[model samples]
Target: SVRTPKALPDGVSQATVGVRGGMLRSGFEETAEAMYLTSGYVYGSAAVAEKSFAGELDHYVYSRYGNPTVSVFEERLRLIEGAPAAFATASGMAAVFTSLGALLGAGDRLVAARSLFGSCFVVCSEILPRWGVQTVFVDGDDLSQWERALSVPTQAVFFETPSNPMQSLVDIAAVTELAHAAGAKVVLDNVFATPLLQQGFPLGVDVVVYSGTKHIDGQGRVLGGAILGDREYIDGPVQKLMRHTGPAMSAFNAWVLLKGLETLAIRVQHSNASAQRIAEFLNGHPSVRWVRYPYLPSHPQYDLAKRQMSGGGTVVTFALDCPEDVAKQRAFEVLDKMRLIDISNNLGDAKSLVTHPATTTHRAMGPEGRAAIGLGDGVVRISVGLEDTDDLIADIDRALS
Candidate 1:
């Protein structure tokens, strides 16, 4: 899938750039990106090492701070997203926490959407508050709720657009404007809205974070994450926290993710097209109570989806039309009977995955909490993969039957 670029004029496509951009060639000039698998770099002289350590010169001091392979991955991703700078982390959660922990201190107040990935919710609702950093959660879709929450001065505001499991969307531009007026920096989790589908910076978001473990490592081979923003944010808290905390991505993982980026555009588009078909199938099925995909007109935020996203995205959420007590039973049955799709908590894979949020990802959030976000007992979240559309639909039909 990797292709070297041809010598041409300006306006080369991002897909071309994503695969071949930021390539650092050693004396060998290998076609594949080289991995620098070492703990630290050596300096020519004691004075040189001293100067490098004292910030008098630019050099990689330690693997925890920087590496050539990781640098290549960061620059490639930054170019792909059109971000000014990017920092890679060991895992997605690392990216999430570092982005917030770096920017905020005990006295700071943070406001975020109620709908978030389970770990993210724990970070904001549980972890941050424990440190005396005031944390507030608001309904993601309600601009008025956002307004009320942002009325007071805040240090940062964070939320996931097209939130996990339920697929709820927050109006990026609208909430960004409100946060800025109230003196807050907005951080957006762009995992579900893959960079190939949506661009956050243009909408005024100050920082964008991603779980490279998901779509970026589309094959599910390694764990990686990224925090992207202007040079100030990257050089300030983000760099300071990463340099000391030791959440750096390994050279091997960075190399794998580099290859993953080469095919991200194609894989995402295939899954997006398949997800739309699956959503449409489930919408009209007798066993399905309801379906939610951004492209589908039945979605509550249909107009916003069209305005904000290029495609419906890869995940399709739906529920079975059974009694409340039997809903879980039906969901389990489908998972057990599936032939082509796997029952797993992970998403954004080349293989299809079906998760029962009530028992898996959102299990940490009890029944009452789940209900607050409209995640019902019967609800099923399917991460559409790069499988044949008709074959996937047939698998669902058999599972439902």
Candidate 2:
């Protein structure tokens, strides 16, 4: 199902890169990538350890530093993403924290899109503020707000395109240009869009982060995250912060993730097509208020989504036409009624998942905060998976009734 570059040409297809790009081998040359699970590497000679510690040697030193299996996952993702360098961390949040923690210092300003994942919002508005980093949020759909914030000198700009639960999208090229003019690094959370649907680097994204626990490990096996960027930032600040704090992904988890990447192209393709069909169905339904999907013409940023994404992506969000206060109960009734879909906060799985933002992922935002982003009580987000579109539609249709 996979082949090495030695048997082929200079460059291979994206699918090939996922399955075989980072194939690390040894004298044995196993067909599959080997997992170097040991915590610390043995130095054949004492001077070797000294040189490795002194940074004179590029050999493996410790799992905390890195492992062969981890490199397999990192390299595969790096090639697939077309980024110069990359690093893997324990979970998606760890990658999020590291990308920002490594870059911003005290008194630095951070500009962010107003619509972000709940924890991401907290990281920007709550946690970073205590450290003397002034975080500013702007409506993702408004370029005027971006221009205002990026007019000043800033350290970093962060946001998630196709934002969680709502499927709100940001204009990557427009914002990246603004941030660059202000001498800021553009960091994007590529979770919801997945690496395959959207290529962030071509859109001028300086750094891209992922929670491999999602689509990368599409079956929900291991928890992992990755940061991909130009060589300087990834090896410099990102490395400095990650190596010291030891928030690196385990070799075992790395092995699982690299294997997961093998089928990402196929899995996401099926899920994206299924999601598009479902979004269209919900949009026409009388019980639905409005649906937000990149490919839907009714979406506010459908044009931008067309330019930014190759596919419709794996999630669809819609609100029920119910009173604001009763929205929650109605949304829950639909969720509880679903026989096929699992009611879970987690997204990007082989199994279809549904979650209510107000009570689940975004509760901390409070009513006013959620309202600011157009997330009302009736809003429900569904992570469309590899299930049959017919079965999924039947399940959701039953829930709505």
Candidate 3:
């Protein structure tokens, strides 16, 4: 009906999940996903309603338990995640906490990588301890450390691949093998590496989590996250905590994120190309002390990043050339001078954004915590966006000077 009918084959494959996956039809039959905003459903009769809640019938009884629109989003995400089932949450941190919260209780142990998102660190370090959930931290890149920690029969093993602010990596297959052998479930935050760039299931990761705020909603429109795993695990541990705590996502937010999933591949690829270029530019800049991008040769785990990830992700982490005492001053000057890239803590956006972890996102980590993750006062994290490579480079170039 429009401009030459954009060439689509008669039928597409499931492999093209982002473009055409998880379509839940309605009586209206709209082309776009329908928004089911009702909190409660109308059952055919009173008897049917009781059965729906009692699990005698597979019907959605409550929005907090499930929703048609949210189900579609979860289905789409699970398809991309290569998971049998997935649970959508109110935020990334919800997914992070919920994915593991119910599984562990008093006396259970969680072994996690030393490097983590600031909030994630808090949950693993500060909050979990209150309930007697023992936690251990280790250098992710070193297998000896993982083996040393996994020696104990832990309940769960958690870590982020290409971790926040630092770009530190965890060896997925290696750690999963160790954890499984030690009777632990492996939960990984796949935020920095979007599903398109990495596959977690085949690598034996039990639970793969995402901050849909990042790559899933690449345009920076909404907040959402997901927990993906085999159906049994999701229906068991994931459903129990989520049902009572009610960290369910809004119907409208899921709809916004559903649209975001359609073009995630294109947005992530375009943004990643720009990020690789920006990383190279910063790699040798006179005013930069260090640079880290999964694909950059100088990155400590470049080989590992290449072995596992299909593509380098869109974030670039680096340090400014200045003493620690003056590092914050130098970092702030560059951020203030930026005429194009925005100053924001958010990442995986359609617009380039930058933040100094020492003062913003990772500030709560404290000096000792910051030192543990290589987050110095000079560290700068830039989430590359869909922009002209030359213009973005120029902005960063001028700012550095």
Would you list the clashing residue pairs of candidate 3? none
lDDT of 2 at 172: 87
Q: Which candidate tops lDDT?
A: 1
Ranking by lDDT: 1, 2, 3
TM-score of 2: 0.97
The residue-by-residue lDDT of candidate 3 on 1-401, one tens digit each, is 11011233545644477776777676577777789889998877999888888987878888997888888888888776778788999999999988889668989999989888889989999898898999998998899999898897889989888888788888888898999999998888988888888888899988888988887888888889899887898898789999998998999999999888888877887888888888999997999999989999898888998999987899999988899988988888999999999899898888989998888888887899798777899989898988899999999888887
- State the lDDT at 94 in candidate 2: 93
Query: Which parts of model 3 have CA positions greater than 4 angstroms off?
Result: 1-15
lDDT of 2 at 181: 96
How close is every model to the real structure, measured as TM-score? 0.97, 0.97, 0.95
Error (Å) of candidate 3 at residue 245 is 1.0
Quote the RMSD, in angstroms, for model 1.
2.8
**Candidates' C-alpha lDDT:** 0.90, 0.87, 0.86
Give the Å error, residue 126, model 3: 1.0
Counted clashes in each candidate structure: 0, 0, 0
Clashes of 2: 0
Tens digits of per-residue lDDT, candidate 2, 1-401, equal 11232333576889887776877577797888787769887778999899889878887777886777888788888888989888999999999988998889898989998888888888899888898888888988899999988888999999998888778888889898999999999999999888788998988988999999999888877898998888888889898988888997998999888899899999998998999999999999999989999998999889988988898888898989998867777887888898889988888899999888888899999989988998888888899888789999999888888
